[PDB]
């Protein structure tokens, strides 16, 4: 027992971070069989992010611009090509540590481990979500770009997200495999503004199952309630909505604990409304939304990989 | 910006765990060189447990019973040996994946990463800090035993934790990679009652640190406070008491910010007498002690491993 925000060992993505440099600026690539993917914004001086025309400062590059390090071995690129907002390095080279892979664009209220590299070089790993607005509050520091977020399946690893951009409020934005932004964000240092950081509740519902199964029940409470009700009090307190594919992804958990679905919603309900009066839930004094339920089934059942 | 609990990259350690079976009995090992390291325990059955004679029941063990699996691999056992609570088993083959590595010991308070692994297998990595009454909260399954606990200084792996129990409670005990228990704790399902669970205050004050860094600055106040003073009410809400050595470790943090140590003292002061009022410090309602100072400027300035 006990429950932890927990990340995918990341030594297969370890074996994928290489360093790209391009003129001036150094960020992190992903090499993966003979290309090396990282952000198109490798291109540009800190000047030309203001109001960078990637397609213009394109037609001054040559493969023999983008300098790829591996550890201590230059990969000799062969060609490149921009796909939506990301650069794809043909290299002489295929990876040889390249492990069981997959391109996956996630949803909203999807968790995901970043392995945070700094020159190619990996830094540290922790678990986010995809927000509801398209943000995630990651750990990113200048130098983080091209770091990529991921989930694994046994032996095979699903790159869901490539670090860009730091916005003004300091929450993250960047894209998926293929160089499509999350969310409306774009390259450019202009301003862009997130919406509401709503809270993920089938989330939160996950890790309402997750503390009952690890004995924390203080906040189990006499109420059931209907989806329609607890969606208006949802809404009042920016929760998302719940829907009956919410409830139907909760079964599992619910059959695991015999605590009905909606009467977990009744719990959490009451602590909206009243709040946690001081206790804490799992180790938190806040309702925690970055569990999915694949994750406390997995966490809580203890699935393996490699 | 932002900042995060993060754990080191697993990459190092993943090529290190491999599975012990003894009798009926899995659990993880550690292959290290031409050594596997694992919870003496594993010689046990659940009856052996409650009262095990450790010495007893190895007479009864040779080389050949101790069955070791790396991957799709059996490992040739050419000797065993007790040193403390573990098992020291030397097989014919140095692990070829075995990085630069120390064994230390950590004092309460020092952070890890743990990656919990079942049958040889790692399933997740999380940041732990070794409590004041030497017990971590963990997150770990029947089978964990033998996950490590380690840091990372650029190459070489530091192991400090090896899971070997859990409490009545749900919390976890363990040892060093000698076999020594971290506390009073013994490899016996018997009563041991954990003793106070005190807040690590020096990475309270770190972590305000980061927060100041990452912009979350309301907690603030207009106070300063000495050592003295600021131990007496440590005192009264189970904290640990803060020292001159503790003040000096802060002293590179306190330069970055430009606050000085006793007034981020008389802030935490104030917010243990007042609470948060239900605001949030780098999305947390409680004061987050699992990272240390250096942790905080290693997160903060981009440190990288390989
Ligand atoms: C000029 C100082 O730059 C920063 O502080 N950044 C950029 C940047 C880019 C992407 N993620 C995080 C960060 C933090
Ligand atoms: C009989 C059921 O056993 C458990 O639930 N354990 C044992 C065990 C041993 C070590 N860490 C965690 C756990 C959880």
Same mark, same amino acid.
């Not at 999807?110 to 070089?121: H, K, R």
């Not at 399946?153 to 409020?169: A, G, K």
């Given at each position: 027992?006990?429950?932890?925000?927990?990340?995918?060992?990341?030594?297969?993505?370890?074996?994928?971070?290489?360093?790209?440099?391009?003129?001036?600026?150094?960020?992190?690539?992903?090499?993966?069989?003979?290309? $090396?993917?990282?952000?198109?914004?490798?291109?540009?001086?800190?000047?030309?992010?203001?109001?960078?025309?990637?397609?213009?400062?394109?037609?001054?590059?040559?493969?023999?611009?983008?300098?790829?390090?591996?550890?201590? $071995?230059?990969?000799?690129?062969?060609?490149?090509?921009?796909?939506?907002?990301?650069?794809?390095?043909?290299? !002489?080279?295929?990876?040889?540590?390249?492990?069981?892979?997959?391109?996956? +664009?996630?949803?909203?209220?999807?968790?995901?481990?970043?392995?945070?590299?700094?020159?190619?070089?990996?830094?540290?790993?922790?678990?986010?979500?995809?927000?509801?607005?398209?943000?995630?509050?990651? %750990?990113?520091?200048?130098?983080?770009?091209?770091?990529?977020?991921?989930?694994?399946?046994?032996?095979?690893?699903?790159?869901?997200?490539?670090?860009?951009?730091?916005?003004?409020?300091?929450?993250?934005?960047?894209? !998926?495999?293929?160089?499509?932004?999350?969310?409306?964000?774009?390259? +450019?240092?202009?301003?862009?503004?997130?919406?509401?950081?709503?809270?993920?509740?089938?989330?939160?519902?996950?890790?309402?199952?997750?503390?009952?199964?690890?004995?924390? +029940?203080?906040?189990?409470?006499?109420?059931?309630?209907?989806?329609?009700?607890?969606?208006?009090?949802?809404?009042?307190?920016?929760?998302?909505?719940?829907?009956? !594919?919410?409830?139907?992804?909760?079964?599992?958990? %619910?059959?695991?604990?015999?605590?009905?679905?909606? !009467?977990?919603?009744?719990?959490?309900?009451?602590?909206?409304?009243?709040?946690?009066?001081?206790?804490?839930?799992?180790?938190?004094?806040?309702?925690?939304?970055?569990?999915?339920?694949?994750?406390?089934?997995?966490?809580? %059942?203890?699935?393996?990989?490699?």
């Amino acid at each position: 027992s006990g429950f932890r925000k927990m990340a995918f060992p990341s030594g297969k993505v370890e074996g994928c971070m290489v360093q790209v440099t391009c003129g001036t600026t150094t960020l992190n690539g992903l090499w993966l069989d003979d290309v $090396v993917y990282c952000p198109r914004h490798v291109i540009c001086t800190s000047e030309d992010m203001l109001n960078p025309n990637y397609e213009d400062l394109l037609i001054r590059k040559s493969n023999h611009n983008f300098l790829v390090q591996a550890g201590n $071995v230059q990969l000799r690129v062969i060609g490149h090509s921009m796909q939506n907002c990301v650069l794809k390095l043909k290299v !002489d080279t295929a990876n040889p540590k390249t492990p069981k892979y997959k391109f996956v +664009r996630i949803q909203p209220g999807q968790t995901f481990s970043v392995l945070a590299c700094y020159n190619g070089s990996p830094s540290g790993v922790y678990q986010c979500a995809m927000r509801p607005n398209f943000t995630i509050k990651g %750990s990113f520091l200048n130098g983080s770009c091209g770091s990529v977020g991921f989930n694994i399946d046994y032996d095979c690893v699903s790159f869901c997200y490539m670090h860009h951009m730091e916005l003004p409020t300091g929450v993250h934005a960047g894209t !998926d495999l293929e160089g499509n932004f999350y969310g409306p964000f774009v390259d +450019r240092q202009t301003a862009q503004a997130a919406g509401t950081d709503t809270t993920i509740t089938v989330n939160v519902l996950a890790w309402l199952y997750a503390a009952v199964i690890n004995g924390d +029940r203080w906040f189990l409470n006499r109420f059931t309630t209907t989806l329609n009700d607890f969606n208006l009090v949802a809404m009042k307190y920016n929760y998302e909505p719940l829907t009956q !594919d919410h409830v139907d992804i909760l079964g599992p958990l %619910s059959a695991q604990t015999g605590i009905a679905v909606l !009467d977990m919603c009744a719990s959490l309900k009451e602590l909206l409304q009243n709040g946690m009066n001081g206790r804490t839930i799992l180790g938190s004094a806040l309702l925690e939304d970055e569990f999915t339920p694949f994750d406390v089934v997995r966490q809580c %059942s203890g699935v393996t990989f490699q």
